[PDB]
Subunit: 216 residues, 6 copies
């Protein structure tokens, strides 16, 4: 990576941490923030390193490649490379494959990221990767948010855990996710607690809803 | 984070330490000082990282979001953003969402924190988070301080452990907590030790109270 | 902490090390040097961090608070704060609560410690804490030094281990501890070895005493 | 290694990490990116270190030596060393054995890598090593891509895992690997899912293919 | 410690390493080089830290105190402190107790070690400690070198291991240890191997002696 | 050690790593590259540290001492120390014992290594140590290369592992080791595979030989 801006190689325990995360948790939603955390300031070389060191899950890793290729193709459409000799004081325009690290050197990647103005190929490629990770996470989620219903003897707290866990893996914008909160959470509660929450009105906090069905 | 003031990415073992803390201890009172300890000099990006890497406990994490949103809304009320072009020498006013890291870049967060005078968005957001963590801890505490009573054969030392453990998780200011100490501790002791402590008078130290009921 | 004088946040494994020490060894005498070791150059913020991250032992932690408050009250008595506007070139007088970190900022704590002449609030508060730790250790020691007596078939070496272990936790100055060595050690040995040591005279080293009762 | 350009010795946990990788995973495809990751900025001395610290697998390590010798011999053919005294301001031409580290000193290796223009002996030798590692991985793969066929009750997702796992270890260029994807994957699926995928047409993504055979 | 010359606090894992060494290996000869290794550049404060963090073994730790006090008393005899006001440009003469760290501050210890000419109180105290450690190791060794005799079916290699292990813990100068090698090793071998070694003559290497009795 | 050229103490986990290597793997060939790896830039003090921290194996450690003494005696023969006062601008000539670290200070060792021209006592002593380590490894190898013969049902790959493992521990130059490869490997294969390899001719690679006897 590059620390704020001097270049550094990816650390053994960063590498190891990422490997263990995928081994232990597969593609559970929290893996993605972990990935981003472990890739702060990462060059495409470091990002590819993290991806390539994953054994197994090669259907997902292939899916991720395609997503990255789609995003790369789109970048090329919007940003066409122009014919001409790259002047002494300047550096060339990056393609999608240069951003994905496959067709660019470490020094070129360092060049784009540090040069003024900054061309953050690390952070661009990272967004493409996270995009592909979301597609995987969402596909690899077994349950739908519509199916999360509170059991008759289930403590509300456990139902809310399942609800927002499943919600975290849903393919939905924030406005849609807002609708799911205000509609489904109360709708799919068990009869006893459902009554209790309906009596609070449709503008009570989760704290208030959780403390309300705490006894029941 | 930023070390005293050069920017740095959050370390693998900081990340891992925070993850294990929540796994092992859930939301026991000591988790909060640990959080603060592990987030010293943290930017909103680093703070969000720590929060987002938590798997499970999504009812609490959602509660935390709402608290953060409430604190954000309050910040906006007190600090209204003004219309105008941000001059070359200056930086824009942060909103609550910029402080919560959701609508601000890493560079902007670095900008506010390092610029003179300092606009410590890291430390502001951290207070909001700790506020929300307290709401969770206090809600997730099973016992009330009123219910902590010494068993007939219970060593005083173990009763005082339970008392100040439960006290640590109570929703109460210091003055109220002072009242609980001077009132309940002696009140809820077992008959034999209760007599002993009453004889010391109402201005004896815990050391004196503990050593007094040490034999009994 | 501050490394010799640039400020730094407390490390994950410092934090973790302190936590494990208390978990594994409770308040055994060696915990205190460990605490001091792990808190070298620590600010009050770092010291409070270490204390607050302890789960359980809240009777002791409360005792420690009172001791710290007593030492704070005493500091205020000897050092009264004066009325007046703090000039541009100067910094305010610290109270006991500023030294205990509860009423002072990190920057103020950094200010006092680095400014010339040095006002070492870190090292002052640390002494108060160690004072309170001793009160706990000594109270939480089950045995008295008077009760350490050598068994009839006990190897002297094991008796000396028990003696100086129990001695380490005693409430006694060095002169009193010197008296205990020269009086009790030989006095409370078993008959066979007691005779042997009496024959050496009252000015023989522990090495000489241990090697003398090595065969017996 | 050399960090961007100051020289450094290879770290204990880099060393250990590489050792454990080979112990745990033998020569599974992901070992190679790990090797490269752990050898970022490595000198030939550091590269030889990593190779020599491997116990066992000495048939492979010998194979690797031969590959390295072949690449070394080829370098010498293309780059013949010229007779003459190396001037004060200059440094000598590296042979293949100098690149492989066997006939060059650490200082010479540092010299070539840092001097302008750069003579990256570290990165050249690394390519030769990775070349030899591929020969081993590919030879040590038990299965052929032609033999990966979906079981009648096998979830497609598991079949795609096996397919792209085995594909990763194949001796094939990208164009050949593209042909294998578009030809064999669908061809060797089980009857029920095979029909489903044929109906999508020959330009559907893996995401679309995987989600299509998700129910079946 | 002080790294070559900037001051630093003792690291968590240095501390922990020393603690585990004593727990696992007690006072086996190799502990002493480990101690010295872990205390490279250590101030008396750091040295006392390492010693004080040892739980158990308090007979030995007390023995060590006495040795340190003896060495301190001897230093004072040879180096008497003179009466007079310490000038602005100078620093005071250290006593034995200042060297042992008990009566000197960290800054004074830093002062003596860094000032020109150097007054290495760290390295002086370290020698006293190692002196006391040897007394302990040698006392705590169960066996004498005279008692190491080769069993009739014992492989010579195992006998030489026992011999030089026991030799390492002996109270003897190098000349005496040389005599033990050339005299006892061959003398105390078993009849079959004893004959073999006598035939080599009295100037053969251990390699030659070990390879000679390898078959037998 | 000294990092490229500022002095540093040997790290806890370097120390620990070396200790574990000897505990786990004794004197298996790969230990030697590990030693060298862990001793990059090491002073004689650091080298002695690593050697002295080994518990057990004292027959080997004694053998190593003798080898070091032999190499030291040889250095003294070739490099005789001259009589005269060492001038202010210069430093003294090192003896073998100064190189082995026994009769030289840390500062002298730093002096020789950093001064121009460089007198690399660290790297000289290291060669002597590795020389002595080879003598041990080779002596402690149970099997001869002549005795490695392929079993009738043994996969060739396992036979080649045993061959080059045993070869690695042999006392032989590269030319002799080349002869062993081209002569014995094929000679000592089992009848079925022996025939197969003879048919390839006497200039086929190990890759070709291994892939040839892969089916058989
Ligand atoms: Cl790869
Ligand atoms: Cl851009
Ligand atoms: Cl997230
Ligand atoms: Cl502000
Ligand atoms: Cl707290
Ligand atoms: Cl003061
Ligand atoms: Cl080797
Ligand atoms: Cl080149
Ligand atoms: Cl102590
Ligand atoms: Cl001196
Ligand atoms: Cl030693
Ligand atoms: Cl030389």
């Amino acid at each position: 990576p590059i620390v704020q801006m001097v270049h550094q190689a990816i650390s053994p325990r960063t590498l190891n941490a990422w490997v263990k995360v995928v081994e232990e948790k597969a593609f559970s939603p929290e893996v993605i923030p972990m990935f981003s955390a472990l890739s702060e300031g990462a060059t495409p070389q470091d990002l590819n390193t993290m991806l390539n060191t994953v054994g197994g899950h090669q259907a997902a890793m292939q899916m991720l490649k395609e997503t990255i290729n789609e995003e790369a193709a789109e970048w090329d459409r919007l940003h066409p490379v122009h014919a001409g000799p790259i002047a002494p004081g300047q550096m060339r325009e990056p393609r999608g494959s240069d951003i994905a690290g496959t067709t660019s050197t470490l020094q070129e990647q360092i060049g784009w990221m540090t040069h003024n103005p900054p061309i953050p190929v690390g952070e661009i490629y990272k967004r493409w990767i996270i995009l592909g990770l979301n597609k995987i996470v969402r596909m690899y989620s077994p349950t739908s948010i519509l199916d999360i219903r509170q059991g008759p003897k289930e403590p509300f707290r456990d139902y809310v855990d399942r609800f927002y866990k499943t919600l975290r893996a849903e393919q939905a914008s924030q406005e849609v996710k807002n609708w799911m909160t205000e509609t489904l959470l109360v709708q799919n509660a068990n009869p006893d607690c459902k009554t209790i929450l309906k009596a609070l009105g449709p503008g009570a906090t989760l704290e208030e809803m959780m403390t309300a069905c705490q006894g029941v």
